[PDB]
Amino acid sequence: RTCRIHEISCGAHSTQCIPVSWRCDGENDCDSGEDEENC
Amino acid sequence: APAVTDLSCQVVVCTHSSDFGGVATLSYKTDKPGDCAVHSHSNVATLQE
Ligand SMILES: [Ca+2]
């Protein structure tokens, strides 16, 4: 986890860094719901 | 940006209706996830997104 600041880990059960632009984008991109939770 | 490669297309359905009646799944090989711009270079078909 903790990739370059342009990326966020979309989960904690396994490492999966994805674009920060996808946080609260309207869909879950990964195995864990923290795209859309409590924006 | 993503280094998108091996881009290929198949058209899942196409009706030449007045709306966006065609659907084309795009198979690609990237190196990272990311937002790519998409365009149709020939004016016979306009994309929705
Ligand atoms: Ca998302």
From Swiss-Prot, chain A:
| Disulphide-bonded residues | 3-17, 10-30, 24-39
Give the result of residue 7 to A, as annotated.
Complete loss of interaction with Semliki virus spike glycoprotein E1
PTM comment, free text: Glycosylated.
Tell me which residues make up the LDL-receptor class A domain: 1-39
The reported effect of residue 22 to A is:
Complete loss of interaction with Semliki virus spike glycoprotein E1
Where's it found, cell-wise?
Cell membrane; Membrane, Clathrin-coated pit
Which tissues is it found in, per the record? Abundant in heart and skeletal muscle; also ovary and kidney; not in liver.
Question: Which residue stretches belong to region (Microbial infection) Interaction with Semliki virus spike glycoprotein E1?
Answer: 7-29
What the protein does? Multifunctional cell surface receptor that binds VLDL and transports it into cells by endocytosis and therefore plays an important role in energy metabolism. Also binds to a wide range of other molecules including Reelin/RELN or apolipoprotein E/APOE-containing ligands as well as clusterin/CLU. In the off-state of the pathway, forms homooligomers or heterooligomers with LRP8. Upon binding to ligands, homooligomers are rearranged to higher order receptor clusters that transmit the extracellular RELN signal to intracellular signaling processes by binding to DAB1. (Microbial infection) Acts as a receptor for Semliki Forest virus.
Its quaternary organisation is: Homooligomer. Binds to the extracellular matrix protein Reelin/RELN. Interacts with LRP8. Interacts with LDLRAP1. Interacts with SNX17. Interacts with DAB1. Interacts with PCSK9. Interacts with PAFAH1B3 and PAFAH1B2, the catalytic complex of (PAF-AH (I)) heterotetrameric enzyme; these interactions may modulate the Reelin pathway. Interacts with STX5; this interaction mediates VLDLR translocation from the endoplasmic reticulum to the plasma membrane. Interacts with CLU. (Microbial infection) Interacts with protein VP1 of the minor-group human rhinoviruses (HRVs) through the second and third LDL-receptor class A domains.
Write down the disease named in this UniProt entry: Cerebellar ataxia, impaired intellectual development, and dysequilibrium syndrome 1: An autosomal recessive, congenital, non-progressive cerebellar ataxia associated with disturbed equilibrium, delayed ambulation, intellectual disability, cerebellar hypoplasia and mild cerebral gyral simplification. Additional features include short stature, strabismus, pes planus and, rarely, seizures.
Q: What is this protein called?
A: Very low-density lipoprotein receptor
Originating species: Homo sapiens (Human)
UniProt gene name: VLDLR
- Whole-protein residues included: 111 to 149 of 873
